[PDB]
Structures are given as structure tokens and as C-alpha cells.
Amino acid sequence: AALADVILYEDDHILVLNKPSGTAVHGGSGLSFGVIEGLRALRARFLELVHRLDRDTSGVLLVAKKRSALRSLHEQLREKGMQKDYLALVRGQWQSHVKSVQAPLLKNILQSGERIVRVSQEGKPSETRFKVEERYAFATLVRCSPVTGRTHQIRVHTQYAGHPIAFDDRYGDREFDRQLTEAGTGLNRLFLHAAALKFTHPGTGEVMRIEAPMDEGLKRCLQKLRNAR
């Protein structure tokens, strides 16, 4: 209920999914599959992920169905001619003057294929923009716009700022997650959601904006905290 809602947009050029939290976008290092292999298994044709969301993130996921479309979309990403807005629920009260984090990032890949990313002044130049959406008693909903698209960039930028994401197992704060559980939110996954993607359609050249609803769990969490105080 409903499988049809996974599909946000499709034509001959692109396919745009509302990726569920918990589902990997492709297979891991060993015996595993994700969204992209699942989709190829329904078809010889061209299909390629334009970008990635991590396993626990949900929301807007763009897949190219033509080489010309990947060509165009790669180039938009490179030239920062995409806007991806995410919503994150973060610890404490995000400060209004903190409009960006510019902390450079290093990644290592672990024996499992999983990634751990860290701020290092010797890492890859990275930038996220932030805009407070809603404030709760001990948390904030922030719109997080990665300019660069590094691995776990938002998760590490928010942590680095002093405001890690709710239920982030790698970079989060278990006491913040405890507090969310006692407030009765029911939250049971990383609160990070790719809410909107803006880009140019590679076939018609029109500017498009595609938005993903948050799942019921996220929504109930937020409802619980709005009316909590």
C-alpha cells in the first residue's frame, strides 16, 4: 500500500522513485541486491542511477533510462544545476545564523562495504546549506540542501554542527534517540528524507521539480513533537 506510490515520475528518459527507508539502491559487496538490480530484472535496456541515497535515507531517487539522459543529468550534478532538498530531524535547536557547513570530508570503506565518513581538513571540499523548518522542544526540522553530493555529507555536516540526525546509528546520539522514544514519537529509522529534487528534463529541457511524501512513521514523529509542547 501502495506499490504504485513508489513511482513519482516516469517517462522514456527518466524514472523517479520515492525510495523507502531500509531499501538499498544497489547491491552491497557480497550476496545482495538493491533497487537498481531489481529493476533490471524486470527487463537488456539502459538503466543507471544518477545519484545515490543511503540505505536508511528515503525520498527522491533519480534513475536514467537513456544514455542521453544520464549524460545530461551527470552534467547538471557537476555544474551544481540540480537542487536536492532534504528534511532532517536533528538534535537540539539548530542555530539560525548557521546557513552552511563547509567541512571537508574523508571516507573510508570497511570490510563490509559500508562507509564511515569523517570531517578532515585534508578531505574533499564539501558544502551543505541549512534552513530551519520547524522547531520542537528538543529538536529541529531542518531543510538541508547539499551543494556537493558527498557520501553521508548531510549526516556528518549536521553532526559536526552539534545537531546529529535522529536515529543515525553511525553519527547520531543514542540519548537523543532515547528522548525521542520516551516522547512517544514511534520513530524507528534515520530521520533523513530527500524531499524535493529540481533539475532540467534532459529530453524536453523544461525545469521540473519532483517531491516525495514522507512515510507515515516520519509524519507521526513530527505530529507527536509539534503537539508535544
The two beta strands, 192-200 and 58-64, are parallel
Signed CA dihedral, 81, 198, 206, 36: sign only: positive
Scored b (16 or more CB within 10 A) or e, 149-165 reads ebbbbbbbbbbbbebbb
The angstrom resolution of this structure is 2.2
Residue 100 has, within 13 A of its CA and on its CB side, a CA count of: 10
CA angle 90/107/35 to nearest 5° reads 75
Give the span between the Cα atoms of 128 and 50, in whole angstroms: 19
| Bridge partner list, 108 | 116
Give the span between the Cα atoms of 54 and 45, in whole angstroms: 25
The residue whose grid cell reads 543529468 is: 73
Give the span between the Cα atoms of 208 and 206, in whole angstroms: 6
Q: Which residues contact 45 (CB under 8 A, 6 or more apart)?
A: 65
Please provide the DSSP assignment of 103-148 as one string: --EEEEE-TTS-EEEEE-TTSB---EEEEEEEE-SSEEEEEEEESS
The residue whose grid cell reads 538493491 is: 34
Give the span between the Cα atoms of 134 and 93, in whole angstroms: 10
| Cβ pair 162, 130 in contact under 8 A | no
The two beta strands, 14-19 and 58-64, are antiparallel
| Cβ pair 69, 203 in contact under 8 A | yes
Give the span between the Cα atoms of 44 and 51, in whole angstroms: 21
CATH classification for the domain delimited by 1-229, as one of 3.30.1330.10, 1.20.810.10, 3.40.250.10, 3.30.2350.10:
3.30.2350.10
Spot the catalytic one: 11, 12, 54, 85: 54
Count CB neighbours of 71 within 10 A: 12
Give the span between the Cα atoms of 45 and 92, in whole angstroms: 47
Q: How is residue 29 written as a grid cell?
A: 559487496
Q: Which residues contact 187 (CB under 8 A, 6 or more apart)?
A: 89, 166, 167, 177, 180, 181, 217, 218, 221
Residues in the chain: 229
Give the span between the Cα atoms of 131 and 222, in whole angstroms: 17
Q: Which residues have a C–N gap over 2.5 Å right after them in the chain?
A: 43
54 is catalytic: yes
Q: Which residues contact 36 (CB under 8 A, 6 or more apart)?
A: 25, 26, 47, 48, 49, 63
Method for structure elucidation: X-ray
Q: What is the DSSP letter of 226?
A: H
